[PDB]
Design a protein around this ligand. Structure first.
Ligand SMILES: [Cl-]
Ligand SMILES: [Cl-]
Lengths: 111, 106
């Protein structure tokens, strides 16, 4: 049979989805770049590095979607903790609407 | 405002349309516009198409169309077929995981 694929090479396909995932994770509770990265890796998106997550967090700030608190993490070191602003909450809802639209149309293209 | 989500999905979709029969830029654009993606300009489509050329995923043929006007036609190469199969496998894995996230499960 076919070789068991550990599912790498997802970077390009995750463009557009990545931002939505991060906003979704932030919506659930205050979190930081290292934790967000590990959340995405454990979900199965194994190749996303911390450095990439930082760029997206910067983009989210510029979009006005997140609120930033510097404080000590539970393990010790200071972290930048992100929460959703009301605009972030609304943009997340918009993401799910657009992602649902796109999924349905891709299922038509497959059909 | 679907341009950002379509990035990294549109390549897979265009390869799929090409697999179904020999086609050209204007036709693929119209196919995608009629499907619901009305913000997509032909410039975007041709760029993916040429991106696919430089990756050896498509074979090109300049010839007269059925109606007469000459066009640059696209078919999949052996690499293009394999890439499309990989695309569907990768997309189903990603879709599965995001659906768990949406449902609150992950
Ligand atoms: Cl940090
Ligand atoms: Cl042409």
């Amino acid at each position: 049979g076919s070789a068991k694929d550990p599912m790498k090479g997802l970077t390009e396909l995750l463009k557009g989805s990545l931002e939505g995932m991060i906003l979704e994770r932030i919506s659930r509770g205050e979190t930081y770049g290292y934790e967000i990265t590990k959340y995405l890796n454990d979900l199965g998106f194994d190749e996303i590095v911390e450095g990439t997550v930082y760029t997206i967090l910067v983009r989210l700030e510029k979009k006005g979607l997140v609120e930033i608190e510097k404080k000590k993490s539970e393990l010790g070191p200071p972290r930048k903790f992100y929460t959703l602003s009301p605009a972030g909450e609304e943009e997340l809802a918009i993401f799910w609407k657009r992602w649902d639209f796109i999924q349905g149309k891709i299922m038509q293209v497959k059909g």
